[PDB]
Amino acid sequence: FDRDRLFSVVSRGVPEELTGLLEYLRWNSKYLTDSAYTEGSTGKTCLMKAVLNLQDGVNACIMPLLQIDKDSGNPKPLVNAQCIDEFYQGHSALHIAIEKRSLQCVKLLVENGADVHLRACGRTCFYFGELPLSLAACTKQWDVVTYLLENPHQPASLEATDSLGNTVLHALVMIADNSPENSALVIHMYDGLLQMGARLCPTVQLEEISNHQGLTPLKLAAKEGKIEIFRHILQREFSGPYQPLSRKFTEWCYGPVRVSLYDLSSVDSWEKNSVLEIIAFHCKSPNRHRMVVLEPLNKLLQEKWDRLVSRFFFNFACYLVYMFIFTVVAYHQPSFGESMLLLGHILILLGGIYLLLGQLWYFWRRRLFIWISFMDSYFEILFLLQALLTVLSQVLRFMETEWYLPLLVLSLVLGWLNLLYYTRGFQHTGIYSVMIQKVILRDLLRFLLVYLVFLFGFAVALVSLSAPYRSILDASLELFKFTIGMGELAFQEQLRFRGVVLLLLLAYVLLTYVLLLNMLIALMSETVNHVADNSWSIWKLQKAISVLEMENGYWWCRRKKHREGRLLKVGTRWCFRVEEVNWAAW
């Protein structure tokens, strides 16, 4: 019956759940819908309440409850109580039992048949993998995970997918955290499951299954910013009977030298969407600059940066030549002839078209998505802006318009200003790389706005109080001179008797001094801290971005990527020789 009194008596009212009658005879009419109205309140079942019991004795009484009923006129939905609430959909009692640390309960539940490949969702606030095996692995239940996949007549596939395409290995990475108490658990369970996978089915590699978006556990650990598990996977050296299928093995260890062969699944060539692109481009975590100082990556980055450093300075020289030519042509503007002005105009127009096409191609390829909108792309917008201004100014010359000269001059100024993009070559300007964006953002576009607001509020008052012809030009020009140190104050004539005019300037100078004093302290506050490290890593990230961008080639296709490694012997595999030299001194 649906009466709550009977269920309360059976479950909690009295441990004597063996009433005898129950639904043993004449109750076999229930064959279509044995849930909701007849079982549970709205989305639960009697099995869920039975498995919620704490004492082992009453837990052992579950088997008599489902005895005979498991093979009675009751239909197939015996244990798989798929909730239709759309909120806890498919949250059968098996997941609850696995959540409980008891082993005999889950053993009894699985021995009665049931199913282990049922999802926990149909698409809360706790993502574990939406699978029984995934939940058991994430809950660190060694006995449950050991028993689920081998012992029963119906096993659980180790490479079973998920709603999003994940597997247990992906799930162990998604739930990972930088906290050591969770990092140790994740690493230990990942290693144990990887080792057991070899025993179960060694004919399939578990770290090659991709998500619906094409990511593997190594790449999934890099996109999401998880550093500890990523570091462990990069430097995995587990050996013994399962020494093969690893990542870092030493070749010889003569003295302090420990030359080793790091495996490479993070090579740009012959592999699209590698780990380096994900770290550099497709990442938004605060740790993205900390994942590039790792040992197997620094050597690969330097061996490409040194090999491709001539082109950086070649482009630098070619840009300096273009800027010198632009300045020379601009300076000799009449307002020799027909021999240098025409050639300079043609060269400037061609140079502008070149930089316009290059920046358009760069934006089309890379930034089809959001560029974090706040970092690492300012110099890629300033180049486009300068090229567009130069092209427009050079076009407007043929129209005999008066706006050609201001646009040309502004383009020249912006082109000279953009030369700071190359300060990251041999020049170790990492000191300015720290306080070059954290001092302009939120500090020059936030406090300067208030200063402009005060200036424009005082200029109009000065004009309206008193011959000033323009409200926002005549008074503003003299009001701005207080900041630079050229403001002039006087008692003036006696047409308005003045007085308040002096008071307004006295207020203005005090306000524009206290604002500067506060602005200085605001930027100083971020100097006492962020000193220990917090540098030399973002510089390496910028160098990595530059190296990755260069290898794609120029606007045309006069560049093709080349191989990085070689078919080194597996041992029973493209590898990179890292000649570690560390004085452990033991």
TrEMBL record:
It is a multi-pass membrane protein. The chain holds residues 75 to 715 of 761 of the full protein. It catalyses: Ca(2+)(in) = Ca(2+)(out). GO terms for molecular function: calcium channel activity. It comes from Rattus norvegicus (Rat). Residues 312-533 form the Ion transport domain. It is found in: Cell membrane. This is Transient receptor potential cation channel, subfamily V, member 2. The keyword Calcium applies. One of its GO terms (cellular component) is cell body. Keywords: ANK repeat, Calcium, Calcium channel, Calcium transport, Cell membrane, Ion channel, Ion transport, Membrane, Repeat, Transmembrane, Transmembrane helix, Transport. GO terms for biological process: positive regulation of axon extension; positive regulation of calcium ion import; positive regulation of cold-induced thermogenesis; response to temperature stimulus. The lineage of its organism: Eukaryota, Metazoa, Chordata, Craniata, Vertebrata. It comes from the Eukaryota. The chain crosses the membrane at residues 312-331, 339-357, 369-391, 403-423, 444-465, 495-516.
